[PDB]
Amino acid sequence: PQDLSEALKEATKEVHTQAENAEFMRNFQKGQVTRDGFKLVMASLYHIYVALEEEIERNKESPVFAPVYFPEELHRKAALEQDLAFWYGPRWQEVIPYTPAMQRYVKRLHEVGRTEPELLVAHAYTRYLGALSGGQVLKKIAQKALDLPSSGEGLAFFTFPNIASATKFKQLYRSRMNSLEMTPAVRQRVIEEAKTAFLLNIQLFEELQELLTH
């Protein structure tokens, strides 16, 4: 259209469906994910968000990213660390897995963070705006399914405590994106990188899936 925000939303409409329909994402929606599989995604989110957030601290002051810099509001690193300690034990840093589908995603994140920063925004957008436009169902089914004891831990990642209204924030973010300066080329690329994002995720589920069935 004419809004960076409306462009992406639409551009990734199809791939998003591809993401939803993943064999591992659908088994989840239908609430049939074992503690093992759930323990895999948490370990995936951790590696992705550390890379993501790390590259964000690199371009925090950069004009290409500064406008969407919201550390308190969004940063998930600490949230995932807390969760991962519950899921793997005080030794999670030592035990947790690091698969090749995780490695690609992390690798892409850094290439972008250093040679194509103007694109970092597409990933931030996908991760943060994604898990903010829909983190309720991910929690709703997470809760019921796993039915872990009354431990009160392991799912912090799903609660952005520093945002009262998701509605208003998602609105501030789109405003800030739409305010990002970028040449027609860069724009088409950023949109293209948002697709890249989804493919890294979709490719991730599939790899976590084959991993379960062993």
Measured from the CB atom, is 65 or 105 closer to ligand HEM? Answer: 105
How far is it, in rounded angstroms, from Cα 130 to Cα 139? 14
Measured from the CB atom, is 85 or 203 closer to ligand HEM? Answer: 203
Q: Are 179 and 69 in contact (CB under 8 A)?
A: no
Encode 158-184: b = buried (16+ Cβ within 10 Å), e = exposed: bebeebeeeeebbeebbebbeebebee
| Binding of residue 8 to ligand HEM (CB under 6 A) | yes
Which residues, 6+ apart, have CB-to-CB distance to 40 below 8 Å? 97, 208, 211, 212
Residues within window 29-88 making contact with ligand HEM, judged by CB under 6 A:
29
For residue 94, the minimal CB distance to ligand HEM (Å) is 28
Residues within window 77-136 making contact with ligand HEM, judged by CB under 6 A:
126-127, 129-130, 133-134
Residue 9 counted as an annotated binding residue? yes
Measured from the CB atom, is 162 or 171 closer to ligand HEM? Answer: 171
Neighbours of 61 (CB within 10 A): 9
How far is it, in rounded angstroms, from Cα 113 to Cα 94? 26
| Binding of residue 25 to ligand HEM (CB under 6 A) | yes
Measured from the CB atom, is 89 or 134 closer to ligand HEM? Answer: 134
| Binding of residue 139 to ligand HEM (CB under 6 A) | no
Residue 176 counted as an annotated binding residue? no
Size of the site for ligand HEM (CB under 6 A): 15
Residue 125 counted as an annotated binding residue? yes
